[PDB]
PDB file of all heavy atoms in Angstrom:
ATOM      1  N   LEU B 217     -65.337   0.716  28.518  1.00  2.00           N
ATOM      2  CA  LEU B 217     -64.500  -0.431  28.815  1.00  2.00           C
ATOM      3  C   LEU B 217     -65.287  -1.607  29.376  1.00  2.00           C
ATOM      4  O   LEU B 217     -64.688  -2.609  29.761  1.00  2.00           O
ATOM      5  CB  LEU B 217     -63.398   0.007  29.774  1.00  2.00           C
ATOM      6  CG  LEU B 217     -62.026  -0.611  29.606  1.00  2.00           C
ATOM      7  CD1 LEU B 217     -61.605  -0.446  28.170  1.00  2.00           C
ATOM      8  CD2 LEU B 217     -61.074   0.124  30.505  1.00  2.00           C
ATOM      9  N   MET B 218     -66.608  -1.530  29.379  1.00  2.00           N
ATOM     10  CA  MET B 218     -67.472  -2.517  30.003  1.00  2.00           C
ATOM     11  C   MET B 218     -68.165  -3.391  28.961  1.00  2.00           C
ATOM     12  O   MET B 218     -67.979  -3.244  27.752  1.00  2.00           O
ATOM     13  CB  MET B 218     -68.501  -1.825  30.895  1.00  2.00           C
ATOM     14  CG  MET B 218     -69.654  -1.181  30.155  1.00  2.00           C
ATOM     15  SD  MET B 218     -69.111  -0.046  28.878  1.00  2.00           S
ATOM     16  CE  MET B 218     -68.765   1.416  29.838  1.00  2.00           C
ATOM     17  N   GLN B 224     -74.562  -3.540  36.138  1.00  2.00           N
ATOM     18  CA  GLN B 224     -73.307  -3.427  36.857  1.00  2.00           C
ATOM     19  C   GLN B 224     -73.348  -3.836  38.326  1.00  2.00           C
ATOM     20  O   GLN B 224     -72.291  -3.855  38.962  1.00  2.00           O
ATOM     21  CB  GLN B 224     -72.789  -1.993  36.757  1.00  2.00           C
ATOM     22  CG  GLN B 224     -71.303  -1.910  36.658  1.00  2.00           C
ATOM     23  CD  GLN B 224     -70.801  -0.518  36.793  1.00  2.00           C
ATOM     24  OE1 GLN B 224     -71.536   0.377  37.189  1.00  2.00           O
ATOM     25  NE2 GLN B 224     -69.542  -0.313  36.464  1.00  2.00           N
ATOM     26  N   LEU B 226     -73.902  -2.166  40.715  1.00  2.00           N
ATOM     27  CA  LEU B 226     -73.676  -0.970  41.508  1.00  2.00           C
ATOM     28  C   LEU B 226     -74.794   0.019  41.220  1.00  2.00           C
ATOM     29  O   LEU B 226     -75.357   0.035  40.125  1.00  2.00           O
ATOM     30  CB  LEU B 226     -72.321  -0.337  41.196  1.00  2.00           C
ATOM     31  CG  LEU B 226     -71.064  -1.063  41.671  1.00  2.00           C
ATOM     32  CD1 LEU B 226     -69.845  -0.301  41.237  1.00  2.00           C
ATOM     33  CD2 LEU B 226     -71.057  -1.255  43.175  1.00  2.00           C
ATOM     34  N   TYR B 227     -75.128   0.828  42.214  1.00  2.00           N
ATOM     35  CA  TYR B 227     -76.190   1.810  42.087  1.00  2.00           C
ATOM     36  C   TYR B 227     -75.604   3.208  42.105  1.00  2.00           C
ATOM     37  O   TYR B 227     -74.522   3.441  42.644  1.00  2.00           O
ATOM     38  CB  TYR B 227     -77.221   1.670  43.210  1.00  2.00           C
ATOM     39  CG  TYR B 227     -78.171   0.527  43.011  1.00  2.00           C
ATOM     40  CD1 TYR B 227     -77.765  -0.775  43.224  1.00  2.00           C
ATOM     41  CD2 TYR B 227     -79.473   0.751  42.613  1.00  2.00           C
ATOM     42  CE1 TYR B 227     -78.620  -1.815  43.037  1.00  2.00           C
ATOM     43  CE2 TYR B 227     -80.337  -0.284  42.429  1.00  2.00           C
ATOM     44  CZ  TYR B 227     -79.908  -1.566  42.646  1.00  2.00           C
ATOM     45  OH  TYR B 227     -80.773  -2.613  42.457  1.00  2.00           O
ATOM     46  N   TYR B 228     -76.322   4.132  41.491  1.00  2.00           N
ATOM     47  CA  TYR B 228     -75.978   5.540  41.521  1.00  2.00           C
ATOM     48  C   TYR B 228     -77.210   6.335  41.902  1.00  2.00           C
ATOM     49  O   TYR B 228     -78.337   5.937  41.610  1.00  2.00           O
ATOM     50  CB  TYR B 228     -75.433   6.030  40.171  1.00  2.00           C
ATOM     51  CG  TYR B 228     -76.456   6.042  39.071  1.00  2.00           C
ATOM     52  CD1 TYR B 228     -77.051   7.220  38.658  1.00  2.00           C
ATOM     53  CD2 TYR B 228     -76.823   4.869  38.440  1.00  2.00           C
ATOM     54  CE1 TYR B 228     -77.981   7.228  37.666  1.00  2.00           C
ATOM     55  CE2 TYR B 228     -77.757   4.866  37.448  1.00  2.00           C
ATOM     56  CZ  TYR B 228     -78.332   6.048  37.062  1.00  2.00           C
ATOM     57  OH  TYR B 228     -79.266   6.048  36.060  1.00  2.00           O
ATOM     58  N   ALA B 248     -76.622   1.135  37.376  1.00  2.00           N
ATOM     59  CA  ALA B 248     -75.835   1.594  36.243  1.00  2.00           C
ATOM     60  C   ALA B 248     -75.766   0.476  35.211  1.00  2.00           C
ATOM     61  O   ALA B 248     -75.341  -0.639  35.519  1.00  2.00           O
ATOM     62  CB  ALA B 248     -74.441   2.012  36.693  1.00  2.00           C
ATOM     63  N   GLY B 249     -76.197   0.765  33.995  1.00  2.00           N
ATOM     64  CA  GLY B 249     -76.223  -0.241  32.969  1.00  2.00           C
ATOM     65  C   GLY B 249     -75.849   0.307  31.614  1.00  2.00           C
ATOM     66  O   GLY B 249     -75.282   1.392  31.486  1.00  2.00           O
ATOM     67  N   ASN B 252     -77.165   3.924  30.493  1.00  2.00           N
ATOM     68  CA  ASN B 252     -76.527   5.100  31.077  1.00  2.00           C
ATOM     69  C   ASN B 252     -75.074   4.745  31.377  1.00  2.00           C
ATOM     70  O   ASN B 252     -74.721   4.405  32.508  1.00  2.00           O
ATOM     71  CB  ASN B 252     -77.276   5.555  32.321  1.00  2.00           C
ATOM     72  CG  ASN B 252     -77.077   7.030  32.618  1.00  2.00           C
ATOM     73  OD1 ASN B 252     -76.187   7.674  32.068  1.00  2.00           O
ATOM     74  ND2 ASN B 252     -77.903   7.568  33.501  1.00  2.00           N
ATOM     75  N   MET B 253     -74.221   4.850  30.362  1.00  2.00           N
ATOM     76  CA  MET B 253     -72.820   4.504  30.542  1.00  2.00           C
ATOM     77  C   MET B 253     -72.031   5.594  31.239  1.00  2.00           C
ATOM     78  O   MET B 253     -70.940   5.321  31.741  1.00  2.00           O
ATOM     79  CB  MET B 253     -72.168   4.190  29.196  1.00  2.00           C
ATOM     80  CG  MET B 253     -72.236   2.727  28.799  1.00  2.00           C
ATOM     81  SD  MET B 253     -72.104   2.485  27.025  1.00  2.00           S
ATOM     82  CE  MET B 253     -72.570   0.765  26.886  1.00  2.00           C
ATOM     83  N   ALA B 254     -72.559   6.815  31.291  1.00  2.00           N
ATOM     84  CA  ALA B 254     -71.823   7.916  31.895  1.00  2.00           C
ATOM     85  C   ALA B 254     -71.684   7.745  33.404  1.00  2.00           C
ATOM     86  O   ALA B 254     -70.673   8.147  33.985  1.00  2.00           O
ATOM     87  CB  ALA B 254     -72.510   9.237  31.564  1.00  2.00           C
ATOM     88  N   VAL B 255     -72.704   7.169  34.044  1.00  2.00           N
ATOM     89  CA  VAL B 255     -72.706   7.043  35.534  1.00  2.00           C
ATOM     90  C   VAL B 255     -72.122   5.696  35.975  1.00  2.00           C
ATOM     91  O   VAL B 255     -72.051   5.468  37.191  1.00  2.00           O
ATOM     92  CB  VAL B 255     -74.123   7.254  36.101  1.00  2.00           C
ATOM     93  CG1 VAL B 255     -74.620   8.668  35.847  1.00  2.00           C
ATOM     94  CG2 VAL B 255     -75.108   6.233  35.558  1.00  2.00           C
ATOM     95  N   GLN B 256     -71.687   4.865  35.029  1.00  2.00           N
ATOM     96  CA  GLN B 256     -71.141   3.522  35.360  1.00  2.00           C
ATOM     97  C   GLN B 256     -69.855   3.646  36.189  1.00  2.00           C
ATOM     98  O   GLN B 256     -69.016   4.500  35.860  1.00  2.00           O
ATOM     99  CB  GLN B 256     -70.912   2.748  34.062  1.00  2.00           C
ATOM    100  CG  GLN B 256     -71.049   1.243  34.225  1.00  2.00           C
ATOM    101  CD  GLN B 256     -71.759   0.604  33.059  1.00  2.00           C
ATOM    102  OE1 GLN B 256     -72.500   1.253  32.329  1.00  2.00           O
ATOM    103  NE2 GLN B 256     -71.547  -0.689  32.884  1.00  2.00           N
ATOM    104  N   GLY B 257     -69.705   2.791  37.206  1.00  2.00           N
ATOM    105  CA  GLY B 257     -68.500   2.769  38.062  1.00  2.00           C
ATOM    106  C   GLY B 257     -67.299   2.272  37.281  1.00  2.00           C
ATOM    107  O   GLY B 257     -67.437   1.244  36.592  1.00  2.00           O
ATOM    108  N   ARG B 258     -66.146   2.931  37.425  1.00  2.00           N
ATOM    109  CA  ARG B 258     -64.978   2.565  36.643  1.00  2.00           C
ATOM    110  C   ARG B 258     -63.758   2.408  37.534  1.00  2.00           C
ATOM    111  O   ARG B 258     -63.671   2.994  38.612  1.00  2.00           O
ATOM    112  CB  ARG B 258     -64.688   3.599  35.561  1.00  2.00           C
ATOM    113  CG  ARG B 258     -65.705   3.615  34.465  1.00  2.00           C
ATOM    114  CD  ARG B 258     -65.554   4.822  33.592  1.00  2.00           C
ATOM    115  NE  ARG B 258     -66.509   4.792  32.496  1.00  2.00           N
ATOM    116  CZ  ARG B 258     -67.746   5.258  32.564  1.00  2.00           C
ATOM    117  NH1 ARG B 258     -68.203   5.813  33.674  1.00  2.00           N
ATOM    118  NH2 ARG B 258     -68.525   5.177  31.509  1.00  2.00           N
ATOM    119  N   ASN B 259     -62.809   1.612  37.056  1.00  2.00           N
ATOM    120  CA  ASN B 259     -61.608   1.298  37.810  1.00  2.00           C
ATOM    121  C   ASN B 259     -60.444   2.227  37.519  1.00  2.00           C
ATOM    122  O   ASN B 259     -59.527   2.305  38.338  1.00  2.00           O
ATOM    123  CB  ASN B 259     -61.165  -0.135  37.518  1.00  2.00           C
ATOM    124  CG  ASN B 259     -61.849  -1.142  38.390  1.00  2.00           C
ATOM    125  OD1 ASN B 259     -62.349  -2.146  37.910  1.00  2.00           O
ATOM    126  ND2 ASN B 259     -61.873  -0.883  39.680  1.00  2.00           N
ATOM    127  N   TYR B 260     -60.449   2.917  36.384  1.00  2.00           N
ATOM    128  CA  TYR B 260     -59.302   3.690  35.942  1.00  2.00           C
ATOM    129  C   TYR B 260     -59.777   4.973  35.286  1.00  2.00           C
ATOM    130  O   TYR B 260     -60.856   5.025  34.696  1.00  2.00           O
ATOM    131  CB  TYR B 260     -58.423   2.870  34.993  1.00  2.00           C
ATOM    132  CG  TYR B 260     -57.834   1.678  35.689  1.00  2.00           C
ATOM    133  CD1 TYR B 260     -58.372   0.416  35.522  1.00  2.00           C
ATOM    134  CD2 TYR B 260     -56.771   1.824  36.560  1.00  2.00           C
ATOM    135  CE1 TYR B 260     -57.856  -0.664  36.182  1.00  2.00           C
ATOM    136  CE2 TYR B 260     -56.250   0.754  37.221  1.00  2.00           C
ATOM    137  CZ  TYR B 260     -56.792  -0.491  37.029  1.00  2.00           C
ATOM    138  OH  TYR B 260     -56.251  -1.561  37.695  1.00  2.00           O
TER     139      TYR B 260
END
Side-chain angles (χ1 to χ4, degrees):
Chain B
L217 216 52
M218 77 306 279
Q224 216 190 13
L226 289 179
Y227 283 75
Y228 68 103
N252 205 346
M253 269 156 192
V255 296
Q256 209 140 338
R258 291 168 177 87
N259 274 132
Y260 296 101

